[PDB]
Amino acid sequence: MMNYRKADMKDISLLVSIRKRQLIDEGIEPNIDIDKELTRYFNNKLANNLLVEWIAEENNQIIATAAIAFIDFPPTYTNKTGRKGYITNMYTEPTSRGNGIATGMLDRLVNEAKERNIHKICLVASKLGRPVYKKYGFQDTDEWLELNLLEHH
Amino acid sequence: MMNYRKADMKDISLLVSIRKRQLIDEGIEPNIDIDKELTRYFNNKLANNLLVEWIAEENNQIIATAAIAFIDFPPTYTNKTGRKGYITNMYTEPTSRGNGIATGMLDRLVNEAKERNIHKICLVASKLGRPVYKKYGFQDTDEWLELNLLEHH
Ligand SMILES: CC(=O)SCCNC(=O)CCNC(=O)[C@H](O)C(C)(C)COP(=O)(O)OP(=O)(O)OC[C@H]1O[C@@H](n2cnc3c(N)ncnc32)[C@H](O)[C@@H]1OP(=O)(O)O
Numbered sequence: 001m002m003n004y005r006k007a008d009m010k011d012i013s014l015l016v017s018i019r020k021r022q023l024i025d026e027g028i029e030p031n032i033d034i035d036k037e038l039t040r041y042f043n044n045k046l047a048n049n050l051l052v053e054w055i056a057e058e059n060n061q062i063i064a065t066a067a068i069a070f071i072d073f074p075p076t077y078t079n080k081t082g083r084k085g086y087i088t089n090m091y092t093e094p095t096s097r098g099n100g101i102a103t104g105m106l107d108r109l110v111n112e113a114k115e116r117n118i119h120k121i122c123l124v125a126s127k128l129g130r131p132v133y134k135k136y137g138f139q140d141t142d143e144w145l146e147l148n149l150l151e152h153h
Numbered sequence: 154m155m156n157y158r159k160a161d162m163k164d165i166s167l168l169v170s171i172r173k174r175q176l177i178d179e180g181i182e183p184n185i186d187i188d189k190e191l192t193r194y195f196n197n198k199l200a201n202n203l204l205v206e207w208i209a210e211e212n213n214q215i216i217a218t219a220a221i222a223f224i225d226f227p228p229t230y231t232n233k234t235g236r237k238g239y240i241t242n243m244y245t246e247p248t249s250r251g252n253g254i255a256t257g258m259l260d261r262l263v264n265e266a267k268e269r270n271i272h273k274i275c276l277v278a279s280k281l282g283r284p285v286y287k288k289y290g291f292q293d294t295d296e297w298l299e300l301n302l303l304e305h306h
């Protein structure tokens with residue numbers, strides 16, 4: 001049956017592959033090689049515990065992943081530490097979708113946040129992710145805006 | 154006339170006061186004391202150069218502030234390093250508004266980003282900030298969602 005564990009340094013090449021697989025599944029054009037940058041990101045953030053990535057395994061093949069990154073923003077009255085958990089790297093094997101795996105992963109990620117005294121979580125919703133997060137209680141945020149420096153000047 | 158400089162450690166108590174002033178101007182309820190957390194945030198992020206806060210001064214009173222924080226997200230094909238500049242702490246003295254001060258500050262912050270090989274900037278728009286950022290080229294982002302752990306469980 002399914003087993004859940006937190007990824008270790010030893011798991012990095014798998015996390016890297018699964019992240020690429022996830023992004024391509026989301027429709028992104030894999031135009032350039034980002035292996036070096038992905039591997040460095042996982043190495044650094046896992047080593048410093050600024051990233052926690054849960055995995056679901058069966059027959060020691062990864063069925064699903066889900067991560068939370070801890071990010072620092074300026075304190076405000078509604079979030080005195082300024083810290084937030086940033087949810088990312090969520091992927092469930094297609095034949096395993098619709099069984100509540102990602103939803104149960106969200107529970108585990110929320111727990112990582114609470115254990116670190118974090119009570120605000122955020123994420124960027126993909127097409128498939130969106131109804132899952134909406135169902136879970138994530139809220140629309142018309143306030144977030146982004147500037148691409150290659151596009152505007 | 155106006156002088157612009159980057160804030161130093163010595164400026165922290167001013168940055169702290171101006172941030173509170175800014176948030177209250179935005180309509181937030183200053184319900185709890187966050188001086189300790191604000192001071193620690195500035196101390197840490199300035200010391201490590203993960204925050205750059207520009208100030209505009211006249212007669213050595215601060216007229217405006219504007220900051221950019223450098224935050225790490227997982228690499229993707231459209232942002233290979235995963236890094237982003239997060240714009241924050243923008244405030245212009247009310248009698249000085251509408252003169253293009255915040256807009257010129259945005260130019261300086263974009264420059265901080267480029268000098269660090271960052272080409273994606275993001276922010277959370279306040280009521281007064283929004284038309285400024287829209288005019289500047291920031292784009293709506295329906296993908297960002299947030300969960301408040303005190304509200305949903
Ligand atoms: C923040 C980010 O990480 S964004 C990127 C997200 N990942 C991707 O887009 C990669 C490609 N897509 C995927 O890997 C997947 O579709 C994921 C990860 C988004 C979702 O994984 P899943 O394990 O299929 O999620 P989960 O099973 O919890 O929910 C999906 C659906 O099954 C249903 N479901 C799950 N559990 C139950 C249940 N107990 N009773 C009834 N329906 C259920 C959901 O309600 C939902 O269907 P709906 O849209 O009609 O409401």
Ligand SMILES: CC(=O)SCCNC(=O)CCNC(=O)[C@H](O)C(C)(C)COP(=O)(O)OP(=O)(O)OC[C@H]1O[C@@H](n2cnc3c(N)ncnc32)[C@H](O)[C@@H]1OP(=O)(O)O
Pocket residue numbers: 175176178179240241242243244245246249250251252253254255256257276277278279280281282284285288
């Ligand atoms: C990401 C964050 O930091 S969000 C928080 C932002 N800060 C706050 O909300 C705190 C309270 N509000 C403020 O301090 C201010 O209103 C700020 C910081 C948002 C804006 O500061 P300002 O210096 O007034 O911005 P700026 O002068 O560049 O632009 C504001 C307006 O003056 C006008 N303006 C500026 N320069 C010109 C110009 N050269 N020609 C014509 N109009 C101009 C703008 O077009 C705009 O008016 P509009 O809404 O009709 O388009």
